[PDB]
Amino acid sequence: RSYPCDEKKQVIAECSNRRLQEVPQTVGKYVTELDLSDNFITHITNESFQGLQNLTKINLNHNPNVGLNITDGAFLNLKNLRELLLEDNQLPQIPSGLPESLTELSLIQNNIYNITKEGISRLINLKNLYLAWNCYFNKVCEKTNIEDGVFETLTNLELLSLSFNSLSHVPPKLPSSLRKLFLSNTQIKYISEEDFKGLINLTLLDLSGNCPRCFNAPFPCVPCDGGASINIDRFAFQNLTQLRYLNLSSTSLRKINAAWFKNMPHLKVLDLEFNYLVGEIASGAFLTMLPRLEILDLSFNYIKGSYPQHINISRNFSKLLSLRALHLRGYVFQELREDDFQPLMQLPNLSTINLGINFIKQIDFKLFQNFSNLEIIYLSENRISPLDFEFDPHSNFYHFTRPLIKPQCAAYGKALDLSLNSIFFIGPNQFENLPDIACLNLSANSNAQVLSGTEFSAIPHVKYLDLTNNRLDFDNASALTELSDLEVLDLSYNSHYFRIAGVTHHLEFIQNFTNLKVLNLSHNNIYTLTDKYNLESKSLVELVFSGNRLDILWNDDDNRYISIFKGLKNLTRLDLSLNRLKHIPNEAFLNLPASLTELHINDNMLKFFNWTLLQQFPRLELLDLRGNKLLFLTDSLSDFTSSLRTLLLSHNRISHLPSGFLSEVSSLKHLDLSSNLLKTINKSALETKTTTKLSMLELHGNPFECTCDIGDFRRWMDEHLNVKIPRLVDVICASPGDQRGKSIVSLEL
Amino acid sequence: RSYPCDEKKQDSVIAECSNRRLQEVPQTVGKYVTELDLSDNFITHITNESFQGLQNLTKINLNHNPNVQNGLNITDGAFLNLKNLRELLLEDNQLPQIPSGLPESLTELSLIQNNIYNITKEGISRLINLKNLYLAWNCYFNKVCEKTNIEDGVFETLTNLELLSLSFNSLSHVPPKLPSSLRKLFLSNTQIKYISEEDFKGLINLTLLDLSGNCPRCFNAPFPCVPCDGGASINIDRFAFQNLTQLRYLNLSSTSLRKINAAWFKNMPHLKVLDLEFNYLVGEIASGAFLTMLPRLEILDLSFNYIKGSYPQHINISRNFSKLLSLRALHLRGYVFQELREDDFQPLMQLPNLSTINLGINFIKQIDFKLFQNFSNLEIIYLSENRISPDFEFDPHSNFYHFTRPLIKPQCAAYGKALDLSLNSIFFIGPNQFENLPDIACLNLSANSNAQVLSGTEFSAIPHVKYLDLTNNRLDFDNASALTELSDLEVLDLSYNSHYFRIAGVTHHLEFIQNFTNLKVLNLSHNNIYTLTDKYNLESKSLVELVFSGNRLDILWNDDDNRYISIFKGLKNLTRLDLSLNRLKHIPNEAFLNLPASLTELHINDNMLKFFNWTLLQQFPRLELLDLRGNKLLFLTDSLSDFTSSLRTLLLSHNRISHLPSGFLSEVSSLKHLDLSSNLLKTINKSALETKTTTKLSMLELHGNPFECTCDIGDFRRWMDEHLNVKIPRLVDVICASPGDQRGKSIVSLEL
Ligand SMILES: *[C@@H]1O[C@H](CO)[C@@H](O[C@@H]2O[C@H](CO)[C@@H](O[C@@H]3O[C@H](CO[C@H]4O[C@H](CO)[C@@H](O)[C@H](O)[C@@H]4O)[C@@H](O)[C@H](O[C@H]4O[C@H](CO)[C@@H](O)[C@H](O)[C@@H]4O)[C@@H]3O)[C@H](O)[C@H]2NC(C)=O)[C@H](O)[C@H]1NC(C)=O
Ligand SMILES: Nc1nc(=O)c2ncn([C@@H]3O[C@H](CO[P@](=O)(S)O[C@H]4[C@@H](O)[C@H](n5ccc(=O)[nH]c5=O)O[C@@H]4COP(=O)(O)S)[C@@H](OP(=O)(O)S)[C@H]3O)c2[nH]1
Ligand SMILES: Nc1nc(=O)c2ncn([C@@H]3O[C@H](CO[P@](=O)(S)O[C@H]4[C@@H](O)[C@H](n5ccc(=O)[nH]c5=O)O[C@@H]4COP(=O)(O)S)[C@@H](OP(=O)(O)S)[C@H]3O)c2[nH]1
Ligand SMILES: *[C@@H]1O[C@H](CO)[C@@H](O[C@@H]2O[C@H](CO)[C@@H](O[C@@H]3O[C@H](CO)[C@@H](O)[C@H](O)[C@@H]3O)[C@H](O)[C@H]2NC(C)=O)[C@H](O)[C@H]1NC(C)=O
Ligand SMILES: *[C@@H]1O[C@H](CO)[C@@H](O[C@@H]2O[C@H](CO)[C@@H](O)[C@H](O)[C@H]2NC(C)=O)[C@H](O)[C@H]1NC(C)=O
Ligand SMILES: *[C@@H]1O[C@H](CO)[C@@H](O[C@@H]2O[C@H](CO)[C@@H](O)[C@H](O)[C@H]2NC(C)=O)[C@H](O)[C@H]1NC(C)=O
Ligand SMILES: *[C@@H]1O[C@H](CO)[C@@H](O[C@@H]2O[C@H](CO)[C@@H](O)[C@H](O)[C@H]2NC(C)=O)[C@H](O)[C@H]1NC(C)=O
Ligand SMILES: *[C@@H]1O[C@H](CO)[C@@H](O[C@@H]2O[C@H](CO)[C@@H](O)[C@H](O)[C@H]2NC(C)=O)[C@H](O)[C@H]1NC(C)=O
Ligand SMILES: O=c1ccn([C@@H]2O[C@H](CO)[C@H]3O[P@@](O)(=S)O[C@H]32)c(=O)[nH]1
Numbered sequence A: 001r002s003y004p005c006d007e008k009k010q011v012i013a014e015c016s017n018r019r020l021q022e023v024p025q026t027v028g029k030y031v032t033e034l035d036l037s038d039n040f041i042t043h044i045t046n047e048s049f050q051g052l053q054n055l056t057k058i059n060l061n062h063n064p065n066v067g068l069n070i071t072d073g074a075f076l077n078l079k080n081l082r083e084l085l086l087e088d089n090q091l092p093q094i095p096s097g098l099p100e101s102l103t104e105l106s107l108i109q110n111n112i113y114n115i116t117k118e119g120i121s122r123l124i125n126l127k128n129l130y131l132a133w134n135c136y137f138n139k140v141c142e143k144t145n146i147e148d149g150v151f152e153t154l155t156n157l158e159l160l161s162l163s164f165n166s167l168s169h170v171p172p173k174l175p176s177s178l179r180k181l182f183l184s185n186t187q188i189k190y191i192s193e194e195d196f197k198g199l200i201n202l203t204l205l206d207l208s209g210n211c212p213r214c215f216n217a218p219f220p221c222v223p224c225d226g227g228a229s230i231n232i233d234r235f236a237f238q239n240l241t242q243l244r245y246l247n248l249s250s251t252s253l254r255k256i257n258a259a260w261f262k263n264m265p266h267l268k269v270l271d272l273e274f275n276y277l278v279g280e281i282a283s284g285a286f287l288t289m290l291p292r293l294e295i296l297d298l299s300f301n302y303i304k305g306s307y308p309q310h311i312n313i314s315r316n317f318s319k320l321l322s323l324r325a326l327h328l329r330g331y332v333f334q335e336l337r338e339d340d341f342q343p344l345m346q347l348p349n350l351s352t353i354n355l356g357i358n359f360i361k362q363i364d365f366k367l368f369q370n371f372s373n374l375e376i377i378y379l380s381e382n383r384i385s386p387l388d389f390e391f392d393p394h395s396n397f398y399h400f401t402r403p404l405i406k407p408q409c410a411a412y413g414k415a416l417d418l419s420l421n422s423i424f425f426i427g428p429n430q431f432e433n434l435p436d437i438a439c440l441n442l443s444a445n446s447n448a449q450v451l452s453g454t455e456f457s458a459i460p461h462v463k464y465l466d467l468t469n470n471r472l473d474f475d476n477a478s479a480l481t482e483l484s485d486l487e488v489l490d491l492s493y494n495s496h497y498f499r500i501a502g503v504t505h506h507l508e509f510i511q512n513f514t515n516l517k518v519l520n521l522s523h524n525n526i527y528t529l530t531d532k533y534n535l536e537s538k539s540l541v542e543l544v545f546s547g548n549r550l551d552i553l554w555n556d557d558d559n560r561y562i563s564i565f566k567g568l569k570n571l572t573r574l575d576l577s578l579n580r581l582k583h584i585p586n587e588a589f590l591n592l593p594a595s596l597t598e599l600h601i602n603d604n605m606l607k608f609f610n611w612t613l614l615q616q617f618p619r620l621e622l623l624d625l626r627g628n629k630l631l632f633l634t635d636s637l638s639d640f641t642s643s644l645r646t647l648l649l650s651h652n653r654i655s656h657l658p659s660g661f662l663s664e665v666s667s668l669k670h671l672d673l674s675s676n677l678l679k680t681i682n683k684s685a686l687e688t689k690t691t692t693k694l695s696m697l698e699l700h701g702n703p704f705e706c707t708c709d710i711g712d713f714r715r716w717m718d719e720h721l722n723v724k725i726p727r728l729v730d731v732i733c734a735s736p737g738d739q740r741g742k743s744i745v746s747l748e749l
Numbered sequence B: 001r002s003y004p005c006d007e008k009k010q011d012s013v014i015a016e017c018s019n020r021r022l023q024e025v026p027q028t029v030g031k032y033v034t035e036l037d038l039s040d041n042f043i044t045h046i047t048n049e050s051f052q053g054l055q056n057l058t059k060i061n062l063n064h065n066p067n068v069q070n071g072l073n074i075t076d077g078a079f080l081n082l083k084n085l086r087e088l089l090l091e092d093n094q095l096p097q098i099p100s101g102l103p104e105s106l107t108e109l110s111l112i113q114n115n116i117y118n119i120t121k122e123g124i125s126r127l128i129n130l131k132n133l134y135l136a137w138n139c140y141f142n143k144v145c146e147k148t149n150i151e152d153g154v155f156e157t158l159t160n161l162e163l164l165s166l167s168f169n170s171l172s173h174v175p176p177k178l179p180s181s182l183r184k185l186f187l188s189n190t191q192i193k194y195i196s197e198e199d200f201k202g203l204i205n206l207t208l209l210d211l212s213g214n215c216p217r218c219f220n221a222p223f224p225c226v227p228c229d230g231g232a233s234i235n236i237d238r239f240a241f242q243n244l245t246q247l248r249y250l251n252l253s254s255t256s257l258r259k260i261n262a263a264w265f266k267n268m269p270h271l272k273v274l275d276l277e278f279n280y281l282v283g284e285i286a287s288g289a290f291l292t293m294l295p296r297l298e299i300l301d302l303s304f305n306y307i308k309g310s311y312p313q314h315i316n317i318s319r320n321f322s323k324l325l326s327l328r329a330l331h332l333r334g335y336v337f338q339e340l341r342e343d344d345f346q347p348l349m350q351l352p353n354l355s356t357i358n359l360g361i362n363f364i365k366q367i368d369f370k371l372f373q374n375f376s377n378l379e380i381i382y383l384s385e386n387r388i389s390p391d392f393e394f395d396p397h398s399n400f401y402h403f404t405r406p407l408i409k410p411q412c413a414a415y416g417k418a419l420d421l422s423l424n425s426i427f428f429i430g431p432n433q434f435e436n437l438p439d440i441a442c443l444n445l446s447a448n449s450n451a452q453v454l455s456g457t458e459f460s461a462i463p464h465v466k467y468l469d470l471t472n473n474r475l476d477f478d479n480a481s482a483l484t485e486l487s488d489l490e491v492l493d494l495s496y497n498s499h500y501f502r503i504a505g506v507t508h509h510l511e512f513i514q515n516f517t518n519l520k521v522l523n524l525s526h527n528n529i530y531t532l533t534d535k536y537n538l539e540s541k542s543l544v545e546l547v548f549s550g551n552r553l554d555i556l557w558n559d560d561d562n563r564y565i566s567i568f569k570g571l572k573n574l575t576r577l578d579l580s581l582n583r584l585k586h587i588p589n590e591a592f593l594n595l596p597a598s599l600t601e602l603h604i605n606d607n608m609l610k611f612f613n614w615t616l617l618q619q620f621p622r623l624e625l626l627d628l629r630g631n632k633l634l635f636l637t638d639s640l641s642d643f644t645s646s647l648r649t650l651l652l653s654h655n656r657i658s659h660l661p662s663g664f665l666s667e668v669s670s671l672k673h674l675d676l677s678s679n680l681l682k683t684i685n686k687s688a689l690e691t692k693t694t695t696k697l698s699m700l701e702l703h704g705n706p707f708e709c710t711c712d713i714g715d716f717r718r719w720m721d722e723h724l725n726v727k728i729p730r731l732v733d734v735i736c737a738s739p740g741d742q743r744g745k746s747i748v749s750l751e752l
């Protein structure tokens, strides 16, 4: 049973974020990858990894987590060391004496302003070399020095990244092995014919935002003089015949020279965000040169203090015959008409159109019907209404790279996202002349309307509907009923009316749904309903009811809601978290559907739990009671369930295990008793006729009496290595003084 | 130094002993105490032994005992050896009967929220001096309880009785034989269908009659609700209120009335407050004779009389409302209608003293705003919650049919005429939204999801607004002339407008703030501010108070960015600054130095500070209150006197201090209040118990530290004794964590 790391065989040591002060000397000799990131290690030497001949990969990022002193040659003994991560270590230099066998090296986020032959030039086997984010913004730092030719002997080098450093010029003498070159925010005004002359394997070039566009910069920003654009020689991309990805975001471009692409038949992604291209978008000569381009991003090229009626799309857009996705965030314009998008209407594989954050007031939705293959129409964040460093160095810096539309919703077919607009009611013609929509986001439109069953009738086949974060008035039992095919309904965060006792709250419409699988009513502050107190569906499988008031619905002096979920006959998953529950009436619990496999009652205030009621739940596999105020467990749990597979009990107040407990239920694989009040686990808790089938048991955060008693448990652990127990460095002694703070595992008996 | 209670002087002498986990009435109460609060403890028995030595007790509260975070067993005559007892509170103890042997001296008795179903002479009759008697909420809703048996003439003895509450019990009949001493009588939700001419004859002095909730209106009830068969309205006899000439307040809410007998009011022309909510009175409102019997009426509530499911065009208001010359306040919630025109409120236009008109929750889509001008004296126009566009659920001491909080927050209303349009759908302010308004001094537009770019002209029609609530919207701050038309503006709330602030790519312009000559208070909380456009500093010569909690100073003041290092400095007149919840782990020295030197008050609570530069307090010579609660501080400076002469309150609750520096708590004279509760202190040594020079130290909080209880403490325990003028609250909760013997008990309760 490994300590202090958790070790797995596929053979890896997860030893991260564990409060270590030096490399542990108890690390298995079999290990090949070792992750010590986010620890407190302050020194590395030849002694540090002396045990571990077979080390292939070492991760030392973010040490000490709140300088890392590395010796000359400290790693030289490691002969299979292929990969080395030293990010966020405040290194003043590239450590000396690094082993010849390295293929990956990351020195991101340090204080290295000098890139030397001494340090690098003998590392011939390097595939990827990461040096970014060492001098940037108003960080107090020197300009970056790059010894002439230092990269010349890296003849296997495929990736080199020097971004967010002050370079001023493309370093010379780059090896032609290069696949990817990252030079973003490197302060490089001018690119010349020589700079990339013999790099005929390059697939990725990144030159954003040298000559950045600084208006409204979310970071310290310094433009080229004037507001000049980056200056790229006419012949700078001549021999770049393999380029797939070109990033020119925030280089203040106004013209785009078509001839840059003369020899670029494979260009697939072209990123031009945060430039000044409104002219070029209206007039795009360069579009001719890109009939194989899949992704084009012209986001944020708005002219500040200009908000024209219409977007102006060149006819030459019609040449982009391979375009799957077009991104136009932040063009900023008032009105979208059908004629405005003519030039895109014939693009055979144009699948995604993204118009977020354009402050668009009026759209002509029939526009979208005259398109071949549109799967995702993204219009979030407009003005449609009724008719310890700030930035992640491993992410894109000019856009978010989450999916535009949740996968679970887009899987269903064509999607239209109108979220974060001001559609405060859906008129009779809001959705007229739309394509046949299967997935529809209307979240956060502050919609207050009474839905009656005709509002979604120009688009009857929506299968997934996001209605979250509105203020809907549920005063009609035929609401949403036109959507026969509906499978998923999100009504979370619509509490506005639900809070008000005296208005009507009608939830009857749930039942008129043949195929409805998942319903989310979370955070609606439900405490009263009108007429029909019960939820009912023959199909529903999942109901989330967290963030409501079951404490009030099931108050002792009220009987009306005692069967509120019983009519959910098919139900397997039910979430009752965050309902301020101090106790559930035995009858209301017994009225929970017998079909359940998954029950969550976490983050309430439960003081007792009638375990004996688990007799009526024969399919029940997971029971989650984390974050309540529980004091004890039944001493005969197998009398009550035969199905329970996971039991979650973190953050309760259990101080004692019943005799026999955890040899009680054969079916239990995962038992979680973290952050409770156990001082020991008596010999009696361990006696057993049945061999256990328990594979994971969590005990961290309990106040263990570390003295002679716990020996019997230590043996049990030793005599049950199949039972995994994570966070051993956090299964800690509270007593006594001597053992205070140490893992219960590190004491002699 | 009293234990376990807090004994105060206020003349009186009262002991607060509530919510203290007490299993039994403590015997360590100082035997000269007037009033004892023992509520919310875990006390299980009272006997004549409980209070033996406490003669001069005039008051005991034992509410919610034994209040599991079964019942309170009380023996007969337990209280009798207490001669002076006046007021006794035994609310919410699960009592099965009124206890026997109550002192004759009692004026006030409360038995609210119990299981007492039988009223008896053996309990009540011998209590001659009773002014007030509270027996409500023993049998209601779907509780398992028996009907409520009132022994005949059980109240007839109590000739001094002013107030009797029997509400929320099944009575069925208003008990006969009531003393004529009664001023106020409460029989709400008592199941009393019929009121005879004989039920209130004896009672010539009634100021208050509560008959609400009898034959309740049950549609959409938020409680269990049994209508009367029919469902009939309550039946009140023509001559039921014949002898009730002294009556001031009448509550007939939720009695399913459809018609009101005009002559119910013949002999009460001093009726002041008429509560008629949750009935069926839409007809009576359109044509109502009873409206001419209320010449001295001040408050009329006709809320929630909508007919399901009418959504009529208009409200129909009888011409007879105009004979309500004394009316100060008309509440008309939940009538539910679509439109309001001027001609709809004519009968109200001529009333001299009508200051408040409440139309909340009427799903109103349109309003002719000009109609609020042929009014004389409107100070409050409450239109919140409409559709304008461009372990017992209920508090037994509150009104049950309405919230009683002020309609408009007082700080706002004191400025003058108020107009609350909160919770509507005004998602932009059009150019004519506010024409024909009076001179609005206080305007609430909260929660309208206003997403507009305010540009200096949207409030031209009501330019004298001094308190502007724009919280909970999604304002787009893309114009530096936003709001500048409101010259006189004094308070601006823009909390919870983080929608566009979240989005880095759009502009965020906060420049307008400097254009206000009298702006005193500005609230920018929970806007999630982390980036601003062109101008990076907030500026005002006026501003006294800036609330900036729930924003992102951790980003603004990031180490790799200089731009916002003087963000607050141009707030030259500032005294109160709130920087809480900004996710700060450190504050750059230059940034802290750049806070206004006029600050008397600074909160940096609920951030994540591991270190604080105490030396920097030398630049803040007026600073009286520094609040560093809810952070991760690991030590104090041992040199505090060196950095401040001015500091009175220091709040360090919830940190990780584990050693008090040497000579602390006597460094500074000005320091009255030090809060070190819930830290990691195991001991305090004499080092900090110099106690050199003179200190104004007055309160010192230490509850929640893990004190290790051995001789090492003795010095400090001695120190407590030697300075009693230093108040140390919650001694109960100043607990030993160590060692085993002393676990769980106060530090005060030890010895050699
Ligand atoms: C200018 O434009 C170019 C072209 O679009 C952008 O280039 C991309 O840059 C991003 C951001 O760095 C790159 O994304 C990163 O690549 C790694 C993926 O490599 C492969 O191998 C991994 C496993 O090693 C596979 O799982 C994966 O599927 C890939 O096949 C990721 O490791 C990165 O990390 C992610 O996860 C880890 C988990 O720990 C985290 O550390 C990260 O935060 C993140 O979650 C990351 O995905 C991307 O690959 C680049 N494109 C190409 C074609 O190479 C430029 O970034 C852009 N420049 C700027 C400044 O915006
Ligand atoms: N360009 C862009 N602008 C946006 O505004 C935007 N908003 C969300 N996104 C999403 O961000 C994601 C990242 O796209 P991008 O930044 S243009 O990165 C390039 C590449 O850098 C990236 N990529 C490609 C290969 C790879 O190995 N690693 C990798 O990260 O995927 C993209 C093209 O891949 P491809 O070669 O299959 S044609 C894309 O989605 P997925 O394809 O689901 S990962 C976008 O949908 C945006 N992308
Ligand atoms: N009736 C009504 N309908 C509402 O919709 C509403 N919303 C808020 N409120 C507030 O509820 C509050 C309570 O009013 P109400 O339920 S009508 O109770 C009566 C009385 O029960 C109550 N009162 C009177 C005297 C007293 O000593 N104590 C006391 O509580 O004050 C009120 C007037 O008495 P008065 O003789 O001063 S004209 C009032 O606030 P105040 O500013 O205190 S007058 C209302 O403004 C509403 N009241
Ligand atoms: C029916 O309407 C009547 C008349 O307004 C309501 O009477 C009011 O009831 C409240 C709640 O008990 C009283 O307020 C309380 O007063 C005590 C004594 O000062 C105070 O300690 C509490 O904190 C609270 O403010 C109020 O005084 C009373 N009105 C009068 C004139 O006494 C009655 O409650 C209504 N019935 C229901 C069921 O809502
Ligand atoms: C509907 O729109 C909202 C807002 O655009 C989406 O909510 C975001 O979801 C992401 C990823 O799940 C979260 O991390 C963000 O916090 C959310 N933002 C906000 C403002 O809520 C939601 O995902 C969209 N729904 C679907 C089905 O695509
Ligand atoms: C409302 O409920 C569902 C929970 O069922 C949420 O969607 C699921 O989220 C989990 C991640 O929490 C995914 O692994 C599932 O794939 C999701 N299911 C579906 C159908 O998408 C949903 O996010 C919740 N909504 C909000 C606003 O919290
Ligand atoms: C403006 O309207 C809002 C909402 O109607 C008021 O907010 C309420 O304020 C009271 C007192 O602070 C709170 O107890 C309620 O919970 C609040 N509700 C909500 C939804 O915020 C606000 O106080 C009003 N402002 C003024 C100046 O009167
Ligand atoms: C915005 O901040 C203001 C000023 O701090 C808050 O108003 C005051 O709050 C305290 C109690 O919190 C009162 O004692 C003062 O009467 C109030 N000052 C006023 C009204 O000027 C206000 O509550 C904050 N707004 C929100 C939504 O939190
Ligand atoms: O019978 C009742 C009693 C109270 N209420 C509502 O409960 C709340 C607390 O009294 C009040 O809020 P409202 O203004 S929506 O009406 C009252 C009812 O709607 N019906």
Ligand SMILES: O=c1ccn([C@@H]2O[C@H](CO)[C@H]3O[P@@](O)(=S)O[C@H]32)c(=O)[nH]1
Pocket: A216, A217, A218, A250, A274, A329, A357, A396, A397, A398, A399, A400, B503, B504, B505, B506
């Ligand atoms: O120079 C920049 C880079 C990114 N951005 C915005 O920051 C976020 C992180 O990349 C992104 O969110 P947006 O879609 S508003 O645009 C990006 C800028 O506004 N300016």
Ligand SMILES: O=c1ccn([C@@H]2O[C@H](CO)[C@@H](O)[C@H]2O)c(=O)[nH]1
Pocket: A450, A473, A475, A502, A503, A504, B306, B307, B308, B309, B310, B311, B336, B363
């Ligand atoms: O938007 C509206 C308009 C009217 N009503 C009415 O309000 C009453 C109580 O909410 C119901 O009978 C219903 O007719 C609403 O609920 N919502």
Ligand SMILES: O=c1ccn([C@@H]2O[C@H](CO)[C@@H](O)[C@H]2O)c(=O)[nH]1
Pocket: A302, A303, A304, A305, A306, A307, A332, A359, B453, B476, B478, B505, B506, B507
């Ligand atoms: O509602 C609107 C309309 C237009 N813009 C413009 O969008 C750009 C970026 O926010 C700015 O120049 C601003 O004028 C807005 O910000 N908000």
Ligand SMILES: *[C@@H]1O[C@H](CO)[C@@H](O)[C@H](O)[C@H]1NC(C)=O
Pocket: A514, A517, A538, A539, A540, A541, A570
């Ligand atoms: C029960 O759930 C299954 C799986 O989601 C589903 O196929 C079936 O339709 C549901 N039962 C009913 C009666 O709809």
Ligand SMILES: *[C@@H]1O[C@H](CO)[C@@H](O)[C@H](O)[C@H]1NC(C)=O
Pocket: B517, B518, B541, B542, B543, B544, B573
């Ligand atoms: C400074 O604040 C006070 C109120 O605290 C006020 O009298 C004065 O007007 C303010 N200063 C200026 C320049 O307005």
